[PDB]
Scaffold this active site. Sequence first.
Site, short mmCIF file in Angstrom:
data_model
loop_
_atom_site.label_atom_id
_atom_site.label_comp_id
_atom_site.label_asym_id
_atom_site.label_seq_id
_atom_site.Cartn_x
_atom_site.Cartn_y
_atom_site.Cartn_z
N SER A 1 4.03 7.81 2.66
CA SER A 1 3.39 6.84 3.12
C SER A 1 3.86 6.37 4.55
O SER A 1 5.22 6.40 4.54
CB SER A 1 3.22 5.66 2.35
OG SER A 1 2.63 4.46 2.80
N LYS B 1 -12.26 1.14 9.50
CA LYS B 1 -11.38 1.09 10.70
C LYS B 1 -11.60 0.30 11.81
O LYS B 1 -10.68 -0.60 12.32
CB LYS B 1 -10.55 2.42 11.21
CG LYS B 1 -9.83 3.15 9.97
CD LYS B 1 -8.61 2.64 9.23
CE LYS B 1 -7.69 3.34 8.80
NZ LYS B 1 -6.60 2.70 7.87
N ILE C 1 -2.94 -0.20 3.41
CA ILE C 1 -3.79 -0.16 2.28
C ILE C 1 -5.14 0.73 2.85
O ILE C 1 -5.59 0.30 4.00
CB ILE C 1 -4.37 -1.43 1.75
CG1 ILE C 1 -3.23 -2.10 1.08
CG2 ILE C 1 -5.48 -1.12 0.61
CD1 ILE C 1 -3.42 -3.61 0.92
N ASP D 1 -3.32 -5.91 -7.09
CA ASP D 1 -4.46 -5.05 -6.96
C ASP D 1 -5.52 -5.95 -5.77
O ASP D 1 -5.62 -6.99 -6.01
CB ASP D 1 -5.51 -4.79 -8.02
CG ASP D 1 -6.78 -4.03 -7.64
OD1 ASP D 1 -7.57 -4.60 -6.80
OD2 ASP D 1 -7.08 -2.94 -8.44
N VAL D 2 -5.66 -5.37 -4.48
CA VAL D 2 -5.85 -6.31 -3.40
C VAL D 2 -7.63 -6.91 -3.61
O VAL D 2 -8.06 -7.41 -2.69
CB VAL D 2 -5.96 -5.59 -1.94
CG1 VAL D 2 -4.33 -5.37 -1.86
CG2 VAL D 2 -6.83 -4.24 -1.92
N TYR E 1 -14.39 12.08 8.22
CA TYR E 1 -13.75 10.99 7.84
C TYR E 1 -14.71 9.65 7.53
O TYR E 1 -14.45 8.94 6.71
CB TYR E 1 -12.99 10.52 9.25
CG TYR E 1 -11.69 9.27 8.79
CD1 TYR E 1 -10.61 9.98 8.34
CD2 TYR E 1 -11.94 8.28 9.59
CE1 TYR E 1 -9.64 9.06 8.09
CE2 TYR E 1 -10.92 7.40 9.16
CZ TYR E 1 -9.75 7.86 8.65
OH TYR E 1 -8.47 6.83 8.37
N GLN F 1 -0.08 -1.41 -7.14
CA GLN F 1 -1.47 -1.63 -7.78
C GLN F 1 -1.76 -2.20 -9.25
O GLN F 1 -2.50 -3.00 -9.58
CB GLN F 1 -2.40 -0.77 -7.47
CG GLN F 1 -3.90 -0.89 -7.63
CD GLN F 1 -4.98 0.05 -7.45
OE1 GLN F 1 -4.46 1.24 -6.89
NE2 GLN F 1 -6.15 -0.28 -7.41
N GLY G 1 0.80 -1.16 -0.13
CA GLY G 1 -0.15 0.08 0.08
C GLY G 1 0.84 1.45 -0.09
O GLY G 1 0.30 2.31 0.29
N1 NAD Z 1 -3.22 11.04 7.92
C1 NAD Z 1 -4.09 10.11 8.33
O1 NAD Z 1 -5.18 10.42 8.35
C2 NAD Z 1 -3.47 8.86 8.75
C3 NAD Z 1 -3.41 8.75 10.27
C4 NAD Z 1 -3.62 7.37 10.71
C5 NAD Z 1 -3.39 6.29 9.70
N2 NAD Z 1 -3.30 6.43 8.57
C6 NAD Z 1 -3.10 5.32 7.59
O2 NAD Z 1 -2.25 5.08 6.93
C7 NAD Z 1 -2.19 3.99 5.95
C8 NAD Z 1 -1.62 4.19 4.68
O3 NAD Z 1 -1.91 5.63 4.61
P1 NAD Z 1 -0.65 6.84 4.24
O4 NAD Z 1 -0.92 8.09 5.06
O5 NAD Z 1 0.63 6.07 4.64
O6 NAD Z 1 -0.58 7.16 2.74
P2 NAD Z 1 -1.19 6.15 1.36
O7 NAD Z 1 -1.47 7.17 0.47
O8 NAD Z 1 0.12 5.80 0.67
O9 NAD Z 1 -1.99 5.01 1.66
C9 NAD Z 1 -3.07 4.74 0.67
C10 NAD Z 1 -2.65 3.67 0.08
O10 NAD Z 1 -3.76 2.76 -0.36
C11 NAD Z 1 -3.03 2.05 -1.61
N3 NAD Z 1 -4.39 1.44 -2.45
C12 NAD Z 1 -5.67 1.90 -2.49
N4 NAD Z 1 -6.35 1.09 -3.25
C13 NAD Z 1 -5.50 -0.16 -3.54
C14 NAD Z 1 -5.80 -1.18 -4.28
N5 NAD Z 1 -6.97 -1.67 -4.55
N6 NAD Z 1 -4.81 -2.34 -4.42
C15 NAD Z 1 -3.52 -1.96 -3.66
N7 NAD Z 1 -3.28 -0.97 -3.03
C16 NAD Z 1 -4.27 0.06 -3.03
C17 NAD Z 1 -2.52 3.04 -2.57
O11 NAD Z 1 -1.59 2.53 -3.09
C18 NAD Z 1 -2.22 4.13 -1.40
O12 NAD Z 1 -0.74 4.09 -1.30
C19 NAD Z 1 -3.97 4.05 5.50
O13 NAD Z 1 -4.50 2.88 5.81
C20 NAD Z 1 -4.20 5.14 6.48
O14 NAD Z 1 -5.74 4.82 6.98
C21 NAD Z 1 -3.32 7.65 7.79
#
Ligand code: NAD
Lengths: 257, 257, 247, 253
Positions: free
Chosen positions: C21, C164, C94, C66-67, C157, C42, C15
């Site tokens: 990320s 979640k 993801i 792709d998941v 959200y 993906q 992801g």
């Molecule tokens: N800033 C915030 O609100 C925050 C806080 C806590 C947790 N998170 C969590 O961190 C995790 C990753 O997010 P991030 O902030 O590191 O940025 P990020 O954009 O990299 O996370 C989203 C990822 O999901 C992947 N994805 C979406 N659809 C897909 C598919 N169908 N197949 C394979 N991959 C797919 C994308 O490639 C993307 O990189 C998430 O689960 C998010 O909920 C974010």
Amino acid sequence: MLTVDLSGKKALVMGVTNQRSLGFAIAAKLKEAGAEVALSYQAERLRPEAEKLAEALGGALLFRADVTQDEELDALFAGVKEAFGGLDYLVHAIAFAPREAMEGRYIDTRRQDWLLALEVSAYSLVAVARRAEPLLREGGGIVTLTYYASEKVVPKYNVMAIAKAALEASVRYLAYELGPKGVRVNAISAGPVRTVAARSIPGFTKMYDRVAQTAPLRRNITQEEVGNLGLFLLSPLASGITGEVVYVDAGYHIMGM
Amino acid sequence: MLTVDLSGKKALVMGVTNQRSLGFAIAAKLKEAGAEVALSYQAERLRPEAEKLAEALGGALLFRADVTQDEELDALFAGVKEAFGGLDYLVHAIAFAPREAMEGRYIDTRRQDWLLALEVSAYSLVAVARRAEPLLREGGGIVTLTYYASEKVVPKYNVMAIAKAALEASVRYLAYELGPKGVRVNAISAGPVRTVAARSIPGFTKMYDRVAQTAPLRRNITQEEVGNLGLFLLSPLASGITGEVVYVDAGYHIMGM
Amino acid sequence: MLTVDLSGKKALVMGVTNQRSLGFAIAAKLKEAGAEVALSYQAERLRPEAEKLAEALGGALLFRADVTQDEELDALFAGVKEAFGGLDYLVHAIAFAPREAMEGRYIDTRRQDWLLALEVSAYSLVAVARRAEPLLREGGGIVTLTYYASEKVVPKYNVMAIAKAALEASVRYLAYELGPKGVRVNAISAGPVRTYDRVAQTAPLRRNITQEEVGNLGLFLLSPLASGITGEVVYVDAGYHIMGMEL
Amino acid sequence: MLTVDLSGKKALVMGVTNQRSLGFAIAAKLKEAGAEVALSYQAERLRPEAEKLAEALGGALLFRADVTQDEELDALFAGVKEAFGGLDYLVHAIAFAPREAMEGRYIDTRRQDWLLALEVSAYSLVAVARRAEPLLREGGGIVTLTYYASEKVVPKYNVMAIAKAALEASVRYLAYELGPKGVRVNAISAGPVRTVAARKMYDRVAQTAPLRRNITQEEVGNLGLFLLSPLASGITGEVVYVDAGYHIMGMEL
Ligand SMILES: NC(=O)c1ccc[n+]([C@@H]2O[C@H](COP(=O)([O-])OP(=O)(O)OC[C@H]3O[C@@H](n4cnc5c(N)ncnc54)[C@H](O)[C@@H]3O)[C@@H](O)[C@H]2O)c1
Ligand SMILES: NC(=O)c1ccc[n+]([C@@H]2O[C@H](COP(=O)([O-])OP(=O)(O)OC[C@H]3O[C@@H](n4cnc5c(N)ncnc54)[C@H](O)[C@@H]3O)[C@@H](O)[C@H]2O)c1
Ligand code: NA
Ligand code: NA
Ligand code: NA
């Protein structure tokens, strides 16, 4: 149309000061449902207000009891056995922390202030529950009052937050030990309400105003909303419910930000 | 490889009496990582035992103080300031309740026994945090110990379950108050471990058997597992983590039936 | 000093689409600690960005998957078996919800968008865990990313908060079922990072967290320093979530 | 001597399939309090079963809709509005997972089974809540049923645990969004009762719970009536446990 009919039931409410008291809100509902009610008040200075409250209920037995004194507690419960024979319901609406402990920082709390706060606001539940046990009939119950700061930091609430955490844990252990006799034990977590104990707290109007602008219902709760929840929990309608903390706070506690 | 080097950092560890204790385990991991440790001991008759602990750690400064005595705490912190100049870490591994409070029923707990349990097991954190505050450097922190009995009923844990609930609420208010100085405060909730403290809890042993039989990993945790979590939480690796209660129990607390 | 040495360990990180990320931050620390890393991407149109991330980590193996597609996941894990022989660590980072679901109110979420948000953001942990199971070695682990909104209402959200909540429940059931193999499953609840001045005002530490702070916690949970920890959700948010009102 | 009078109030109850069930128990207590009840049923082949339930309630309007079909839900709510003019209460007692998803391990759940369980058991609350919003009057409310497996691992409950976690978070967000209308949303977490839908777990619960017995269906019915009633006007976003205290315990006895 459904009815709640508590004719024949005997109730003791501890911690009444005036008609805004959350303990008085519960007593008023139990009375209205047909229970025989007794009230206890802290000290002789409060007796004239307490007499006014018994008058407003259309009749209540009155007792004086400071919960820091074990002998005043023995006298209260010998008095209850003589006047009632046995007991169905007990409401614990008592709390206190020194004003010195409630301004400024929790970290700065003096030892004797912290001990007093815990003694009056949490240990008092165990003390009254031990003494009530031999009187309490099957189907009977105990209800206490708590607040959200046990779980999340509310500035200025200080040692009171820590006393409420201790009380909620005592509710669960007491539910386990009294359950085999058919007795239930629960807590009500109320949102802010304008009372003597509340308005002395320096945070009060600030959190009162915050709740109205952030809670799901877009208002504060009323003392009558607390009374109705206490009535339900003690009544036979709640006969499967023990060990529980139930929130009456317009949903404020579910909100982030 | 990633290395964590605590050379130059100074730690005060309170409440340790035996090498089989979660408090010792954390002090031993701090030594392994390069910090200098000072140990408190309760009374001068225990000096020999404190000297053996200090040797088992590979060296430690020793200070006498009973945490129920404020003047003694003032003296201990005067000596720590003279020896170290400032402080980085505080490990709070103090827990006590009277035997009488732990035999028989929670409902039957006596007033002064309940208050002593709470004073020693919960208020002590506030007493030491306040005195540590002006010594504690940016990046520093406080860690304490707890257990599942705070949140759920474990037969025969009695007033210690209530003291731990008070302690966890204390951790949240202290995180709020120390945070702006750049100091963090956290708790570790450990599964049952074969320590000397565990011998003073009548409920401990059947919980030990249950965890091995029913936890996700189908075994109990070790004191070294707890020591590793304490080191992590004090270290710069955990720099974004404060106000937390982190479980190390082979996953037991997530289970229902 | 304390050393964490993961030479010989194999990690799969899923992801990651950019250097911000939280997934990339955990991948970086794993690599610093000595592990070999595989990143999934993906589709083939994003191969360029995946190559760039592999270069920024100082070297990583890349798989397309792709998941939402069971056969692509089957192919990913066959390739992992061939290239690594086994697996120690799986990082699930993801998260996705359609733009329409995230505009306006949760009560107005359309059926199709709600199911896709749950499928990508929650069911995906089950799907990858099932396939990793025969590969995962004793002392191995899975870690996932979550957020406060699973616990408390954060308006806007929307469906991601519900996803979640489903994700955290799956963590607990997965810990139960993988535990007899000696494999652990945990979640990290992260605060906001530069991917707000209000969080900084109310957090106990009076600042936002950094992605390195998330990276470090992921490493710790996967490392043998955390051998007793499973089924847990751990918060790295500068203390924000303990507050009962805004300052 | 205190009285709950729901005369002239209108309820829609969804997901009830037999008389020995928790949703039926709430329906009966609403009737006891004076409310009129409309019941949904899934498919026309279950009309005979639905009619028998309407009779056991002392009369109820019946409305067909499969909760996976948005057009069928649109039709139901059009029929409710024409019949009632509006709504006060909605009881969501809809729970389902495919047999295959419930045999074996959670980690073995197939994609389509998982998504169907979540669609029927959790998304259905959002689908009916959106459609109820314009009909619901101030003081009105929504109640749903849950289980402690959402928070704590109960083996063999499998994807239903996960659907219940999804449901309880939905309850919180909906409470926030419906609150300005003066409408409330809450959940009831019930312990095990001998029900048809339920098909020594019963024995273990009784040994372990503080009250040393299992709860009854009437106990669940009484809590639902309370939450929907004016007595609970300060309470929204809550999951209230009716389980004889079973869930406060940190071990089995
Ligand atoms: N800033 C915030 O609100 C925050 C806080 C806590 C947790 N998170 C969590 O961190 C995790 C990753 O997010 P991030 O902030 O590191 O940025 P990020 O954009 O990299 O996370 C989203 C990822 O999901 C992947 N994805 C979406 N659809 C897909 C598919 N169908 N197949 C394979 N991959 C797919 C994308 O490639 C993307 O990189 C998430 O689960 C998010 O909920 C974010
Ligand atoms: N009002 C609120 O905003 C609010 C919110 C949540 C919880 N509560 C809780 O409700 C309960 C009642 O509070 P209230 O707001 O009605 O205020 P109140 O002042 O009317 O009642 C508090 C009572 O505690 C009694 N008391 C204090 N020390 C005592 C002692 N040593 N011995 C015997 N009695 C003693 C007082 O005499 C008084 O009657 C308290 O437990 C309080 O913490 C109140
Ligand atoms: Na005793
Ligand atoms: Na939308
Ligand atoms: Na199956």
